[PDB]
Amino acid sequence: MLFFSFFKTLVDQEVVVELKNDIEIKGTLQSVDQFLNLKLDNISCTDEKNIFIRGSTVRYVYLNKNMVDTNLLQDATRREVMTE
Amino acid sequence: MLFFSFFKTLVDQEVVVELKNDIEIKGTLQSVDQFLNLKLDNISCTDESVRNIFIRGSTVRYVYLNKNMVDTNLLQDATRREVMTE
Amino acid sequence: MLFFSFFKTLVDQEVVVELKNDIEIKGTLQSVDQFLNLKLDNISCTDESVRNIFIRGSTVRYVYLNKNMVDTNLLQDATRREVMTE
Amino acid sequence: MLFFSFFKTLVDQEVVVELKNDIEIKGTLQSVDQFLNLKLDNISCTDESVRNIFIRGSTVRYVYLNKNMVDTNLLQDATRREVMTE
Amino acid sequence: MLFFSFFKTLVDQEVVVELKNDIEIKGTLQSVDQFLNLKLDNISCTDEKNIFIRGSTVRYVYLNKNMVDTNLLQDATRREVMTE
Amino acid sequence: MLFFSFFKTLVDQEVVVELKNDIEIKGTLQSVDQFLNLKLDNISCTDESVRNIFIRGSTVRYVYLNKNMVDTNLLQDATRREVMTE
Amino acid sequence: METPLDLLKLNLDERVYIKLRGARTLVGTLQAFDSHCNIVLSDAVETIYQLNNEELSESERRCEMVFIRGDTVTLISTPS
Amino acid sequence: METPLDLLKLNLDERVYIKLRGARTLVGTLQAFDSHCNIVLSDAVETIYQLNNEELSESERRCEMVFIRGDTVTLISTPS
Amino acid sequence: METPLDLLKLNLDERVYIKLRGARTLVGTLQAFDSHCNIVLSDAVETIYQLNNEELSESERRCEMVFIRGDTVTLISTPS
Amino acid sequence: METPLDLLKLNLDERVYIKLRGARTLVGTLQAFDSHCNIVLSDAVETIYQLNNEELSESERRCEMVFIRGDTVTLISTPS
Amino acid sequence: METPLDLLKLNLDERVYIKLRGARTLVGTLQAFDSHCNIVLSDAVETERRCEMVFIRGDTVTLISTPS
Amino acid sequence: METPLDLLKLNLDERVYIKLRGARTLVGTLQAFDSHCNIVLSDAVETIYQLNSESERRCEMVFIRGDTVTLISTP
Amino acid sequence: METPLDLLKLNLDERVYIKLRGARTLVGTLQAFDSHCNIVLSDAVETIYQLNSESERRCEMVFIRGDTVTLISTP
Amino acid sequence: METPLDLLKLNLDERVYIKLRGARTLVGTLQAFDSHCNIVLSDAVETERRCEMVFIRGDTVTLISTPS
């Protein structure tokens, strides 16, 4: 739930989703679900080749440094493990 | 529970099931479970007494259908219902 | 539960973990979980910047063991008891 | 010199040039050089933005021809004369 | 001789030599020969992997627009063919 | 004309010639032409009456030598000479 | 946001692009989907691509109805 | 003991090696992680190897932030 | 006739297609060329295709100037 | 400039890196070269690389003297 | 209908062709199976190993072809 | 019927052949197994077949992850 | 000795087998050839072998570039 | 020494093994050759085509192994 919740905050920022098969795709994160299936708006791929992306296909999602509270995220995962 | 309920009404009809590895398999649908595993009858594993076959769901890519076998008006109402359950 | 409990008893003995990609990883079994993800201390790649390794279970092919580490009489008595509870 | 002179006589007749990569290229032979680099007009890829093509010789595998385009009696009389001059 | 002569002028500019095996290598063109064997000074490759480069290995040499007199180069090749 | 002249003095000596495809071929050097094609004697095509072999130059990657077979002082003077010829 | 399932329900009875795993892609009317991404299409056009020797060859196959098992779905695009 | 997860917790804020599927490895600062082994790294340096007809070539890409899906992580190692 | 070179001369300053070895094709303005078919292009757009385990993917790189070695040119075609 | 042969003669009797075609590279003292780039080395260390299953394994082979036929030379680097 | 597993019960002891993940495909008489799709074949031949008894893991069976 | 796992337990403390994923297969004494088909073998011998070859490796105790076991042959 | 090209010219206006690069090989009537081993064939039949297969293609006149000819078999 | 081609002349009519570019390697009796390294073999066997006469292109011969 931690990562779901983490992405819920990223809504509206440009995120770059590297797909497992090397393909890039940059766009505006519009929505996310429990399985981290992402719906991005706008495009495009660099340098040639609005989409729903099956989470089971994403290798990376590249973020920028100042989208994330690196301290609250760390503590967020610290709370995650605690609940066991 | 939607596509389980969909394939349930589809019983006794002739279908074609394309596997992930390009095998065609054309036969009469008899059974289906929650995992969408299939049993077919009087098949012709196209190409080259059979007679029946058991396919685990994880293998199928497509299941080809005929237009008349499906009530598209009520099928898309059925998907509408299940997505409302949140 | 069987192999989880089995591996819990093997904590602190040096093992050799064969990965599905052929690499060796020889180390001291420190921790284990249900999916058989392993944690090794004092690792060394046999033979030709340590220091710990969390190995995700789905990667392991073999874990090599010492006869003396294992009570063979109790191991198969546990699987005998495991198969019965159904 | 042989096949250079041979191809010079084939200027204006439609040919089919098989490339080492299997592609077809059917067109009107307009120009030729020593290395048998070909120039084709009115090209069409048989079968399923023309307009000219300079084909580098080292790519050709076959050039297909019309019996009537060639004087078979003179062709082998030329290679008979070609092999002799040594 | 045209292309030899063409490169002789490019000496001192940064040129990017794409090698036939996809490798980049950017550097300062220091020397060239009849066979277009290039000696570049400085580096490096993008984004990881002073060299003499066998000409028989180069696919491209990327240039910038304002290194080349596009008119004198065109006429230069026009003089080339004429001499036949 | 340098490496032709170099391999000429190298005649009668035992050498190893690694081909582009990893074959080793170890034999006694008898002949060499301007194209640096080779003939070897009493060979052992390592590994698995031979007896001799003809290698076209285009195939060789390395020709392995012994230190004593080469006058490194005069060899590098010989390369110095030929590069001066401009 | 909300749920990407709701972003998909806006495309029932409408034309939809789906990219299957591999160099195949089908396009057709979106008749049904589920949580696992099992989609059912009508009047669909599958189009597979393939090289070989420096070749961008295409091949089309059509059907009146087709069920696609989730597993193979990687991307779903919708035009505007 | 206990949980291999707890021992991974101790490496929060700390430099960490990660190996992925294939010749793909990277080292970040450990920012986040879950029981599916989905992780977030900071200031991370990826190093990849691949062949193009017997042609090994190294690459280095360095992002400032990255989310990696768990289903792609093989090993998590911790330097000295 | 004459020389396939002379007919290539007529396309100086003019838009031109070039196919290289493998699924690699590009279109520039014809700037230069020699009897070895070494050419120079301006404002050129390369289009490449390649597979990564049955994974066709297109790429487009566009430089402003480029020298291509002759030993790599297969076809030189000229649009309408 | 001048001739790259002269840029190579400055490295006679001195240590030289040579990259052969393929994932092999040898390093040794430059004893002889020619116009075709045929180089002859002394006390040389060939080192070939190779993947496999996510592996950057190396292997070294040495010899007191070795002749390298031009054909296989792709790059020649010299340290400073 | 109903359960595909229940229609396998009505197929015990009969000679059955089963396919595996990969090139290998073997045929024998269906002695027993469970819910995990694990199957045990008697007097089995690979199509050549002439196995006495053979335990086949459930996650590896892609097809169970049966003459009727 | 009954249980295919019951037909396995009959082979405990007994020599069994097991083919894995790919060209490797070992034989040894069946010490333990579970639902997922994890096994533990005594005095095992694994073989690797290559054409490009009979490579053998010896060990006294080995745990094999179920994900790699495909075929359990009873001698 | 003498000339291997002289042993070719004996096969002019005659049926010859030629194996090319790869799994393709044709047979036809030898109309012309040169030093570089370029040839022209009459009423030729080319075959392609595949395992993954006997594919045949007919033509009356064909020029074959020497770069692809490896083997000229005299019947 | 001298010319490698002149040492092939002192090898005519003898049974000679020759290798080709690729997997194929064939053996026969050396009847004739030229400067272009074109060779003609009598009574040749591929190691199975039992060719009468065979013309082999010069750019395709990588090895000429000869018993002595």
Swiss-Prot record, chains A, E:
UniProt effect for mutating K20 to A/E: Inviable. Decreases binding affinity for U6 snRNA
Protein keywords: Cytoplasm, mRNA processing, mRNA splicing, Nucleus, Ribonucleoprotein, RNA-binding, rRNA processing, Spliceosome, tRNA processing
Xref: SMART domains: Sm (SM00651)
A Pfam family this chain is assigned to: LSM
Subunit structure: Component of the heptameric LSM1-LSM7 complex that forms a seven-membered ring structure with a donut shape. The LSm subunits are arranged in the order LSM1, LSM2, LSM3, LSM6, LSM5, LSM7 and LSM4. Except for LSM1, where a C-terminal helix crosses the ring structure to form additional interactions with LSM3 and LSM6, each subunit interacts only with its two neighboring subunits. The LSM1-LSM7 complex interacts with PAT1; within the complex PAT1 has direct interactions with LSM2 and LSM3. The LSM1-LSM7 complex interacts with XRN1.
Record has Amino-acid biosynthesis as a keyword: no
Protein name: LSM complex subunit LSM2
PANTHER family per UniProt: SNRNP CORE PROTEIN FAMILY MEMBER, U6 SNRNA-ASSOCIATED SM-LIKE PROTEIN LSM2
Primary subcellular site in the record, as a coarse category: nucleus
Single annotated GO MF: RNA binding
Domain Sm as annotated: residue spans: 2-67
Cell compartments where the protein resides: Nucleus, Nucleolus; Cytoplasm
Result of altering F35A: Strongly reduces affinity for poly-U RNA ends
Family in the record: Belongs to the snRNP Sm proteins family.
Task of the protein: Component of LSm protein complexes, which are involved in RNA processing and may function in a chaperone-like manner. Component of the cytoplasmic LSM1-LSM7 complex which is involved in mRNA degradation by activating the decapping step. Together with PAT1, the LSM1-LSM7 complex binds to osmotic stress-activated mRNAs to attenuate the osmotic stress response, probably by limiting ribosome access to the mRNA and consequently translation. Component of the nuclear LSM2-LSM8 complex, which is involved in spliceosome assembly.
GO biological process terms on file: deadenylation-dependent decapping of nuclear-transcribed mRNA; mRNA splicing, via spliceosome; rRNA processing; tRNA processing
Further remarks about this protein from its record: Present with 2210 molecules/cell in log phase SD medium.
InterPro entries associated with the record: LSM_dom_sf, Sm, Sm_dom_euk/arc, U6_snRNA_Lsm2
From Swiss-Prot, chains K, N:
Consequence of substituting H36A: Strongly reduces affinity for poly-U RNA ends
Similarity comment text for this entry: Belongs to the snRNP Sm proteins family.
Additional comment: Present with 7060 molecules/cell in log phase SD medium.
Species for this entry: Saccharomyces cerevisiae (strain ATCC 204508 / S288c)
Coiled-coil regions, chain positions: none
Keyword Nucleus: yes
Gene Ontology molecular function, alphabetical: RNA binding
Name of the protein in question: LSM complex subunit LSM3
Effect of R21E: Sensitive to thermal stress. Decreases binding affinity for U6 snRNA
